[PDB]
Structure formats: structure tokens, C-alpha cells
Write a protein that holds these residues in place. Structure first.
Motif, PDB file in Angstrom:
ATOM      1  N   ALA A  13       4.701   7.190   0.760  1.00 53.63           N
ATOM      2  CA  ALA A  13       5.372   6.946  -0.511  1.00 53.63           C
ATOM      3  C   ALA A  13       5.576   5.448  -0.766  1.00 53.63           C
ATOM      4  CB  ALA A  13       6.705   7.692  -0.524  1.00 53.63           C
ATOM      5  N   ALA A  14       6.142   4.702   0.183  1.00 53.59           N
ATOM      6  CA  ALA A  14       6.361   3.269   0.012  1.00 53.59           C
ATOM      7  C   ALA A  14       5.052   2.487  -0.124  1.00 53.59           C
ATOM      8  CB  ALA A  14       7.191   2.762   1.186  1.00 53.59           C
ATOM      9  N   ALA A  15       3.987   2.874   0.582  1.00 52.13           N
ATOM     10  CA  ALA A  15       2.690   2.227   0.444  1.00 52.13           C
ATOM     11  C   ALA A  15       2.101   2.401  -0.963  1.00 52.13           C
ATOM     12  CB  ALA A  15       1.753   2.775   1.513  1.00 52.13           C
ATOM     13  N   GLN A  16       2.285   3.554  -1.609  1.00 51.18           N
ATOM     14  CA  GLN A  16       1.859   3.713  -2.998  1.00 51.18           C
ATOM     15  C   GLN A  16       2.641   2.801  -3.945  1.00 51.18           C
ATOM     16  OE1 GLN A  16       1.332   7.728  -4.535  1.00 51.18           O
ATOM     17  NE2 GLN A  16       0.653   8.519  -2.624  1.00 51.18           N
ATOM     18  N   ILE A  17       3.957   2.655  -3.769  1.00 47.73           N
ATOM     19  CA  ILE A  17       4.753   1.763  -4.621  1.00 47.73           C
ATOM     20  C   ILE A  17       4.313   0.307  -4.460  1.00 47.73           C
ATOM     21  CG2 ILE A  17       7.036   0.989  -5.329  1.00 47.73           C
ATOM     22  CD1 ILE A  17       6.695   4.017  -5.703  1.00 47.73           C
ATOM     23  N   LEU A  18       4.057  -0.166  -3.239  1.00 45.91           N
ATOM     24  CA  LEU A  18       3.606  -1.540  -3.015  1.00 45.91           C
ATOM     25  C   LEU A  18       2.257  -1.816  -3.684  1.00 45.91           C
ATOM     26  CD1 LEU A  18       4.651  -2.043   0.696  1.00 45.91           C
ATOM     27  CD2 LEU A  18       5.622  -3.235  -1.235  1.00 45.91           C
ATOM     28  N   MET A  19       1.309  -0.876  -3.654  1.00 46.98           N
ATOM     29  CA  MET A  19       0.055  -1.033  -4.391  1.00 46.98           C
ATOM     30  C   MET A  19       0.258  -1.034  -5.905  1.00 46.98           C
ATOM     31  SD  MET A  19      -2.951   0.816  -2.206  1.00 46.98           S
ATOM     32  CE  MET A  19      -4.194   0.234  -3.382  1.00 46.98           C
ATOM     33  N   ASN A  20       1.020  -0.103  -6.474  1.00 47.55           N
ATOM     34  CA  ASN A  20       1.251  -0.095  -7.920  1.00 47.55           C
ATOM     35  C   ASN A  20       2.010  -1.351  -8.382  1.00 47.55           C
ATOM     36  OD1 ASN A  20       0.065   2.465  -7.648  1.00 47.55           O
ATOM     37  ND2 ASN A  20       1.813   3.600  -8.294  1.00 47.55           N
ATOM     38  N   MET A  21       2.984  -1.843  -7.616  1.00 42.74           N
ATOM     39  CA  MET A  21       3.667  -3.097  -7.929  1.00 42.74           C
ATOM     40  C   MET A  21       2.694  -4.276  -7.900  1.00 42.74           C
ATOM     41  SD  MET A  21       7.028  -4.902  -6.216  1.00 42.74           S
ATOM     42  CE  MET A  21       6.172  -5.548  -4.757  1.00 42.74           C
ATOM     43  N   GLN A  22       1.809  -4.352  -6.907  1.00 43.31           N
ATOM     44  CA  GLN A  22       0.813  -5.420  -6.811  1.00 43.31           C
ATOM     45  C   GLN A  22      -0.256  -5.339  -7.908  1.00 43.31           C
ATOM     46  OE1 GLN A  22      -0.063  -8.595  -6.199  1.00 43.31           O
ATOM     47  NE2 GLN A  22       0.553  -8.289  -4.130  1.00 43.31           N
ATOM     48  N   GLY A  23      -0.694  -4.143  -8.296  1.00 45.77           N
ATOM     49  CA  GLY A  23      -1.567  -3.979  -9.459  1.00 45.77           C
ATOM     50  C   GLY A  23      -0.879  -4.459 -10.734  1.00 45.77           C
ATOM     51  N   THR A  24       0.382  -4.080 -10.937  1.00 50.15           N
ATOM     52  CA  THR A  24       1.165  -4.535 -12.089  1.00 50.15           C
ATOM     53  C   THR A  24       1.285  -6.050 -12.104  1.00 50.15           C
ATOM     54  OG1 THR A  24       2.532  -2.550 -11.944  1.00 50.15           O
ATOM     55  CG2 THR A  24       3.268  -4.203 -13.426  1.00 50.15           C
ATOM     56  N   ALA A  25       1.504  -6.686 -10.959  1.00 53.33           N
ATOM     57  CA  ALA A  25       1.605  -8.139 -10.892  1.00 53.33           C
ATOM     58  C   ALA A  25       0.292  -8.866 -11.207  1.00 53.33           C
ATOM     59  CB  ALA A  25       2.127  -8.524  -9.512  1.00 53.33           C
ATOM     60  N   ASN A  26      -0.863  -8.212 -11.062  1.00 50.69           N
ATOM     61  CA  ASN A  26      -2.170  -8.771 -11.415  1.00 50.69           C
ATOM     62  C   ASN A  26      -2.609  -8.475 -12.852  1.00 50.69           C
ATOM     63  OD1 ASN A  26      -3.483 -10.197  -9.057  1.00 50.69           O
ATOM     64  ND2 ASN A  26      -2.734  -8.401  -8.049  1.00 50.69           N
ATOM     65  N   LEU A  27      -2.041  -7.466 -13.512  1.00 54.89           N
ATOM     66  CA  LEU A  27      -2.513  -7.016 -14.825  1.00 54.89           C
ATOM     67  C   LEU A  27      -1.465  -7.038 -15.942  1.00 54.89           C
ATOM     68  CD1 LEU A  27      -4.701  -4.071 -13.542  1.00 54.89           C
ATOM     69  CD2 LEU A  27      -5.570  -6.050 -14.732  1.00 54.89           C
ATOM     70  N   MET A  28      -0.170  -6.975 -15.638  1.00 57.48           N
ATOM     71  CA  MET A  28       0.864  -6.690 -16.635  1.00 57.48           C
ATOM     72  C   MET A  28       2.204  -7.389 -16.444  1.00 57.48           C
ATOM     73  SD  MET A  28       0.499  -2.793 -17.947  1.00 57.48           S
ATOM     74  CE  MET A  28      -0.025  -2.205 -16.327  1.00 57.48           C
ATOM     75  N   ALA A  29       2.410  -8.216 -15.428  1.00 60.73           N
ATOM     76  CA  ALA A  29       3.643  -9.005 -15.315  1.00 60.73           C
ATOM     77  C   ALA A  29       3.792 -10.102 -16.397  1.00 60.73           C
ATOM     78  CB  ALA A  29       3.718  -9.569 -13.900  1.00 60.73           C
TER      79      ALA A  29
END
Lengths: 450, 450, 49, 48
Positions: free
Chosen positions: C1-17
Motif C-alpha cells: 500500500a505505501a509503495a503505491q502511494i510513493l509512486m503516485n506521489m512521485q508521478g504527480t510531482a513530475n506531471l502535476m505539481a
């Protein structure tokens, strides 16, 4: 069976193939450019502005900088002199060789390579005096050498080295200037004269087994060779944080200010120069711009990007990097509380202290084995069987609170009427095996004056 | 062999090729202009306003200024009872040469070049009487020379110096004014520039070795030659923070002000002076402007930029620069706390203390080796076997909490009835070898009075 | 569960922050968009309107 | 030069082997041969 010439050409290929994996661990400790660390939002010409991250450096330094060996301990059966530090002790000769080799400098270096790459190799020999060295000629040379320079083949049947090659990769990494092959009963060395080997120098030795020992970073029993301490978890968080730093840094160069716009305004009415697309206007602070507005013209803005939106992720990744590493919270997540007292210090350091006490246990085995080979190297034949029970002894990894132990030890000793003998109060104060001897000699002077 | 005439030219090329690498690390400590430090959003006429970031200097000084040498230990024969009296010990001789050379100044300088550039060199000779210097003729002349002025070739096999060369430039400019060769057999020197060279002055030499010892900042065994302390992680946050400071500075000059506009008002109606494009209006505070209202005119403004938006990134890059450096978080942008207790100081400084205790080991080895060469050169012949166990002794790098030690040392000693002999209380109070010597005279003089 | 959140947060930081910036009703040939590449470069130093 | 161009010099032999002038210098490091101002370029840049 196999000849030294063939066995050199075999082991130099295996040594050189090993370097293709070691470069992947050097790249995190040295902080070289890694493709997966580059932040994607940054435009292609701005991607030169790399942002390196120091978690692997911080973590490996925090283990290595608090390992410190003190004198070896050796038992004796019904022994009349158990007081470690006497002139005839096994403990005293092995510690004399430790000092005469400067291993208190060279071992603390070699433990960084052991943590970074997962192995480093101790080597043992007598000094060859024809080189005119600055070494004591009666002690064995003990040298610890990295996996970028020495390689060894381990038989998984016996869990012991068969044979090993040291390759000196010359000036500026061009070519192998010399190679040395260690075998169970002999050592050979060749130097490259020009493009090809000089004939081998050779040496027989009294050991029944190869004079090289791996300091291996065994994480686990099923980890045969030992592993880099810079684990996949901490690798992934180092690169994750580097991407946030580059995207934040590109944002601060492109969008930390708003962009200003005007719509419905004819460029040739604004007086915008047709050759260059610009008009200069003097912009000292309080001036008002009055415009023609014939379209129904108006001003607009694109908003600034808020850099806090990336700092929200930099905080989260510092908490994850701290949690995986087990460092005190203030090493990484320094937006956290500061230990106020000797108990709060023990609480915060507890997981880093236990990490280091476990690596004192693992690296102790390699130095104990190297000292048994050094004994057989200097004195021929078998080893006195008490040396099979020898122990390394190490400084406590915790930050040395003095006053909190000083009156605890004084209240236990109670001027000689108390719970503990003299020497235990010195051991609990943390005075080393070397410095406890000099205290014994000073105490035996003080007791003559009063 | 190679001619001394050629041995300048053959490796003054290598000396010059070294300077291109050293110049990179210098730019960070001297806080010089870098392309990577220039903030990209600032317009090209304002880009002359460089901002420089002091993290590299702060880190190198925080290490270099905390280390100091107290003396040397040489293990005596027949037990650890040596003294400075009649027939004085080995250590009091080597400390006399340390003082007579002012190495307590030259070392604290030379450790700074060793941390900036990654190495510096210790040069040994007798003094020449013929130059009339302010030096004692009877001591070995020892001095430390930077890698900007000296070079050495280190043997890849034994890791000891083969050849070394000084080059001294003119008082300004690129021209050499003297060069000196060190070889095992001899030291040789020239007293004019490249072209117009003098004949070689030459001195025959007593050692089997080159009288140049490298101090080197080896972080790790696989650092062959030592490395700059100003690590790529610390360079990255230095250059990153410099861009944020320039973009914040540009924003304060261009956009910290709301820019005010009027649309639909004709420049002709406002009475704009057409040949200058401006109208002055007499603008004391409370006055109300009134307009005919043009083509249905209205006021507008572009909003100010928030300078806070850049400060939220300056704070994050300070938080990273503290974490990479291991400085106490009261340095750099200071944390919302200060350590208010004697234990909490050791909690904050633990990283910086353990890094300085680590530097004291790797620089101790170079000083011990230079003192063996200085002895072997001035006394001649062999080295007594105990000098191969010689150790430097250094001051505790932590802030000296004198009162917290004084309660603790007093409770341990308990007027001679307590746990430790008197001299161990003097060691734990942190008195240097020369202070613990002079206290024996004062203690013996007090024992005449009672 | 935590590994999925870290990937989605990192994708968001590359595309939508980051805010994504749009203009409507502007002809690409009016802006001077190069029709062979679909882009126009503009010199974007601070406070330019 | 109190009332015109240089008069003929007064002099005093001192017989020392070295010049009786000694530099105090703010040596930052060995490579800083003459010493440098304590007001470093970074402290200038934050002041301005």
C-alpha cells in the motif's frame, strides 16, 4: 593443477567483470549522475542542472565513523595472568601488530569499502626488505585492500577462499601495471614491462590456506558474498528526492513569479518595434501605465507555482529516508525535536547503536581470522588452541555521555566498600584495554604516596 | 634512470595539468563566479548582481578549526612510565621540533588546503645555515606546502612517493621563479624562470625515500590520492541556493510591487506630453485623481510577486545543506531551538565531532610518518623499533563543558579514596600533555606546604 | 500500500505539481507559431508583459 | 618633502640579518600567500 599463467588470465577476467556491478554502488556514494535521478518536468537544456542527494553518504559515514577496535581478548586455562596487557600476552602481541601496521587508520578506511561494495579483503605476508620500506621487519604486513583492486574465489562447499588476484590498474586507470596471484601454499607477482608481463617473482609460505580474508558485509546467513549497505530502499528514496529537487529548482527558475499578459491590444499601437517584437518602458516603482482600450482590452495573469507544493514531498521523503536508515531523526528530518538529556540521547541513537554493534560482530570475525593467519605467518606450525576462542573488543557506538556514567560508577564503587571491584568501574567508564593498563600503573604509584 | 635536467620538464607538465582540477574546488571555497550559480530568470543586464553561498567555506572551516595536536605517544620498553626529566623520553624530542617549526600554525593552515583540494604535502630537510633565517640550526626544518605549489608521483604498487617537485611562481603572473626536485638520493633546486634557468644547486640526502609526505583526505581505500571535502552533494545545494537568491533578488527589484494600469483612457485626454510619453502629477498621499472616463475606462493592476515563495525554497535548501554536511542545525539558517544543556550539546554536535575524530586519524598517519623521516634524517642511521608504534594525540573536537566534567571528575577521584588515579582525572578534564607535565611541578611544590 | 502511494506521489510531482497554462481564441498564425514544429520560443526573463 | 621635493636622506644602520618589518597577515590557508580580507565575497554579496 592449473598453471599460474592460465590461472592469472582466468582470474583477471573475473576481477574485471566484477567491476561492472561495483560501479552501480560507487555511483550512489560518490553521487555521480544517475539517469533515474533526473527530474522529468525540467526542459531538455536545463537538465544539466543536476541536484545530487546525500542520504547514502550520510548513512554509510554514520556507521563507519563509530566503529573503533581496541585490544583482542584471548582466554587461558587455569592461567596465572588473566590481566590483559602483560608483556607475554597473546592480546599484547596481536595489538602490537595492529599498531605497527597502522590498522587503526587502515581498517576504518576498509570498513567504508566493505559497507559501500559489500566486501573488502585483508591480506597477510612477511615484509620483503629489498624494497627499502619504512616498516618494522619483525611484524607481519597486514593490509586491507578494496574489491576494486583485489578479487577472491570462494568455494561454497567449505565457505573459504580457494585463490585470489590483486590487479594494480596503473596510473589514471589505463592498464594493469602489476598483478599478484595468491595460492594455498605460494604467491606470484608479475609486472607489465611494456604491453606484456615480466617473468613472475614468487614466494612459498608456511600456511596451508590462502593468505587473504574477506571482510564481508553478510546481511543474512543466505547472503553468501555480502551485500552493499546502500540497500534498494535507500537507493529508491535517494533518486526520488533528487527528482523533487530538480523539479522544484526548475520551477523556481520558470514559475515562482506570475506571468503578466494584456489582451485586445494592437502591438503597433503600443509602439512595439516590428524588427524585434519588444518595447522598453521605464518601470520605476509607482508609475501608472495608461492604455488605449478600443477592443474592450484587459490585463490578465497566469499564477505563480507555489514552491511549498514540492517541499511537502521533500519533507515526506526525508521521513522515509530517516525511517529506512534508522539514523537519529535530526540527521535527515531536521524539522524534528532535539534530544534534551542523556536518556533522550539513548532513545534517539538506539537503532543506529544496535546497527553498529551488529557490524562490530560481523567484521570482528574477519579480523580474528586475519590475526590467526598472521600468527602462523610469524611463528611456524599450529596455533595454541585458546586462539580459536579469541574475541575482538570494540568501543561502545553510543555518544559518550561522561557525567551520567561518572557518578553512577562512583555510587556503585563507594570508595571500595561498594558493589563492584576496581577494574569494573574502569570498564563501565569506557576506558580502553590500552588505557586501563596505564591507569593500573598510575594507581600503583598513587598507593605509594598515600 | 632519468636526467634531473629532464625530470623538471617531464612532470612540470603534470604539475600544470593538475592545476586545471584544483581550480574547480577553489571556486567553491573562495566563493567565485560559476555559470551554474547564476539565476536564470534574472534579465541579462541584472545578471551582473551575483549572489554567493557560504556553505562550502562553512563546512571546511567547521572541520579545520576544531582539530589541534596535543603531542605524541611512543611506547616505552619496560612499561608505560616515560617522563620529560633527566634522560628524557622520545615524545618530548618530537614535540620540541613541532614547536621550533611553529607547526601548530603550519598544520592548522595545511589541513585547510588538504580539505579543500584533497591533499597537501609535508617537506623535510636540515636548515641551510647560509641564508641567515630565524630558525634553530639543530632541529630538522619541517614545513607544509600546498598542492598549488608542490606535486608528487605516488607508486601505484606500494602507494609511496617516487618523485616530487615544487614550482614557485613570481609575486604576480604565470611565470615560474624557482623549481625544486626531490628524489631518494638528493634534493636539487633552480633560481630562475622557464628559460634562463640557473645551474642546479644540489644536496646529497641520507634517506632511502623522498623527503615529501602527502597529507591526503582519503574517505575510503578506493580513494587512491584523497578527494576534496567539498562533496558534489554540497556543491549541488550551494549552486541551487545561489540561483534562488538571485531570482528572489530580481523579484524584489522588479515584482515585489503591484503594477498599476488604466485601460480605455486616451493619452491625449490625460495630457501625456507626446514627445516624452510621460505626465508628472503632484502626488502627496491623500489626493484623489478624477478622469473624464474615456471610452468607458477603468483601472487595473497586476498583482505583486510573493517574495515568501522563494524563501520557502531557501529554507528547504538550508535543511538539505545541514543534512548533507552534518553540522549542528544552529549553523546555517538557524533552527527554532538551541541546545540548552550539557548533554543536548553532545546530541547536536555528534556528527561533526565524529567526522573531526575521523580526520584526526587520517592526518595523524601523515604526521607520524613525517616525524619518522625527520628523526631518521637528523639523527641518521636506523629508526628505533618503538617509533613504528608512534601515535599522535589530538584535542577532543566537542565544545568543552568544563563544569559538567568538573563535577564528574571530582565524584570519581573522591580525594584519592575514589575510583581513578589522579592522572586519569587530569586526562578526562582534557589537559594537554604539556599542561599535565607542568601540573607535576605545581603538585610537588604544593606537597612542600601541605 | 505505501509503495503505491510513493509512486503516485512521485508521478504527480513530475506531471502535476505545477499549474498548466492555456490561451483560448488565439489563432496559431496570429501568435506566430511555426507551423513546421507547432511551437514559438519567447524570451521570458522576469516581469516581461 | 615638507617644503618641496625630496631632501637628502637621514639613515641608521641596524646590523640585523632581516628587515625590521614583519607582516601580520590574515592567512586563510597555505595557498593564501599574502592573506586576504575577512569581509569575504559571500558576506559582501549578502550586504549589497
Amino acid at each position: 593443477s592449473i598453471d599460474p599463467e592460465k590461472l592469472r588470465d582466468q582470474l583477471l577476467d573475473a576481477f574485471e567483470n566484477k567491476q561492472n556491478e561495483l560501479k552501480s554502488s560507487k555511483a550512489y556514494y560518490d553521487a555521480e549522475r544517475r539517469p533515474d535521478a533526473i527530474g522529468l518536468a525540467v526542459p531538455l537544456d536545463m537538465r544539466k542542472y543536476l541536484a545530487h542527494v546525500g542520504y547514502p553518504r550520510t548513512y554509510v559515514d554514520a556507521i563507519a565513523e563509530r566503529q573503533e577496535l581496541e585490544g583482542f581478548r584471548i582466554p587461558s586455562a587455569n592461567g596465572e595472568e588473566p590481566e590483559s596487557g602483560g608483556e607475554n600476552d597473546p592480546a599484547s602481541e596481536l595489538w602490537d601488530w595492529w599498531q605497527a601496521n597502522n590498522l587503526d587508520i587502515e581498517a576504518t578506511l576498509g570498513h567504508t569499502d566493505a559497507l559501500i561494495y559489500g566486501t573488502a579483503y585483508i591480506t597477510i605476508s612477511m615484509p620483503d626488505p629489498e624494497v627499502d620500506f619504512d616498516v618494522d621487519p619483525e611484524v607481519p604486513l597486514i593490509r586491507v585492500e578494496p574489491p576494486t583492486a583485489l578479487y577472491a574465489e570462494v568455494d561454497p562447499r567449505t565457505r573459504k577462499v580457494l585463490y585470489a588476484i590483486r590487479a594494480i590498474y596503473g596510473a589514471d586507470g589505463n592498464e594493469i601495471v602489476s598483478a599478484t596471484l595468491y595460492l594455498p601454499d605460494t604467491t606470484m607477482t608479475w609486472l607489465r614491462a611494456e604491453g606484456e608481463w615480466e617473468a613472475p617473482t614468487s614466494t612459498p609460505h608456511g600456511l596451508e590456506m590462502v593468505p587473504v580474508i574477506p571482510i564481508s558485509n553478510r546481511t543474512r546467513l543466505s547472503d553468501l558474498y555480502g551485500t552493499s549497505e546502500i540497500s534498494p530502499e535507500l537507493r529508491s528514496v535517494t533518486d526520488a528526492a533528487a527528482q523533487i529537487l530538480m523539479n522544484m529548482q526548475g520551477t523556481a527558475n520558470l514559475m515562482a513569479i506570475p506571468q503578466r499578459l494584456i489582451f485586445g491590444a494592437k502591438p503597433e499601437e503600443l509602439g512595439i518595434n516590428a524588427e524585434t517584437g519588444q518595447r522598453m518602458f521605464d518601470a520605476y516603482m509607482a508609475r501608472i501605465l495608461a492604455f488605449e482600450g478600443g477592443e474592450g482590452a484587459h490585463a490578465e495573469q497566469f499564477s505563480a507555482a507555489e514552491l511549498r507544493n514540492f517541499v511537502d514531498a521533500l519533507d515526506a521523503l526525508d521521513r522515509k529516508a530517516a525511517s529506512y536508515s534508522g539514523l537519529p531523526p535530526q540527521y535527515l528530518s531536521s524539522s524534528s525535536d532535539n534530544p534534551a538529556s542523556a536518556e533522550a540521547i539513548k532513545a534517539a541513537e538506539s537503532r543506529l547503536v544496535k546497527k553498529v554493534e551488529r557490524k562490530n560482530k560481523i567484521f570482528g570475525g574477519a579480523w580474528e581470522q586475519a590475526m590467526r593467519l598472521a600468527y602462523k605467518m610469524v611463528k611456524g606450525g599450529d596455533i595454541p588452541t585458546e586462539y580459536y576462542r579469541m574475541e575482538t573488543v570494540w568501543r561502545d557506538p553510543s555518544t559518550p555521555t561522561y557525567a551520567a556514567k561518572a557518578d553512577a560508577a562512583a555510587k556503585l564503587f563507594a570508595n571500595g566498600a561498594g558493589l563492584i571491584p576496581r577494574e569494573r568501574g574502569w570498564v563501565d567508564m569506557g576506558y580502553t584495554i590500552v588505557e586501563r593498563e596505564q591507569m593500573r600503573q598510575w594507581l600503583e604509584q598513587d598507593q605509594k604516596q598515600g
